[PDB]
Amino acid sequence: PLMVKVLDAVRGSPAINVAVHVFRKAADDTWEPFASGKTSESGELHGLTTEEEFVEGIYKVEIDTKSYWKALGISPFHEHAEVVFTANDRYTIAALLSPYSYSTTAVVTN
Amino acid sequence: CPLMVKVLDAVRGSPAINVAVHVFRKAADDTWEPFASGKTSESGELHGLTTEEEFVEGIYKVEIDTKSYWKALGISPFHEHAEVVFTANDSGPRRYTIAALLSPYSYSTTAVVTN
Ligand SMILES: Nc1cc2ccccc2cn1
Ligand SMILES: [Ca+2]
Ligand SMILES: [Ca+2]
């Protein structure tokens, strides 16, 4: 149901070994841990959740961009990139990273 | 200014007008505290959020209310908002422009930092 893809605009490559955490918004208005992982050699993170687990609600995908850049020896601007969205009854969250800029797009298919 | 936000609409090729922007600063206890807020003008720009005296070192979050923007135009968008989180002023005072480019299912953000 949910997958995350990360690309590096400086090196022209997948962004490998990027930490990603996914949160669901609780009735509290606080963010509850939901799923996490490390992007693969292809820049992708599969297996985050299942159909039965991934209910309607408000989700946050936090991509640890600052750690990624530091591991490359490159100086970054952002602490992270947070992507917040409502799931309404397959989602791909894609991000393209530069040191002082990022973009994110959702690809939503049937 | 030391902090400016600019927002553009990639569907219409125009400034994104009347977009609410909320800025928070991380407190000593690790919570987000309100810092400043405003809305973009007819040029898509938001000036006058803060001052050199008020804009101290810290970790700041700029939350741009993209969902309300698209809903007012009669469009159902994907994201709740666009958030930009950064450490400011660590090596001394800087001027920050945070720009955002909006589409219904996509956004990009860029920072221009000057001394
Ligand atoms: N977010 C995002 C931005 C892109 C920009 C250029 C090409 C592919 C892309 C895929 N995903
Ligand atoms: Ca699990
Ligand atoms: Ca310092």
Side-chain angles (χ1 to χ4, degrees), chain B residues 31-32 34-38 40-41 43-46:
Chain B
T31 67
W32 288 111
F35 183 83
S37 67
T40 60
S41 73
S43 70
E45 302 178 344
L46 167 56

Side-chain angles (χ1 to χ4, degrees), chain B residues 40-41 43-60 62-94 96-108:
Chain B
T40 60
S41 73
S43 70
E45 302 178 344
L46 167 56
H47 296 95
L49 281 163
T50 194
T51 62
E52 290 179 344
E53 292 74 27
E54 185 181 72
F55 189 53
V56 296
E57 291 192 80
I59 301 173
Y60 288 86
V62 178
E63 192 186 276
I64 304 170
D65 181 14
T66 60
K67 182 175 189 189
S68 292
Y69 173 78
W70 292 118
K71 286 188 182 303
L73 291 169
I75 287 206
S76 300
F78 185 75
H79 303 91
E80 290 297 300
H81 52 71
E83 265 164 332
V84 181
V85 184
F86 65 104
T87 297
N89 312 126
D90 186 46
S91 292
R94 305 288 189 270
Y96 298 89
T97 298
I98 305 301
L101 180 64
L102 309 186
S103 305
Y105 279 71
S106 184
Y107 67 87
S108 70

Side-chain angles (χ1 to χ4, degrees), chain B residues 18-25 27-29 31-32 34-35:
Chain B
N18 302 132
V19 176
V21 178
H22 289 83
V23 182
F24 303 89
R25 183 183 175 279
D29 67 2
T31 67
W32 288 111
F35 183 83

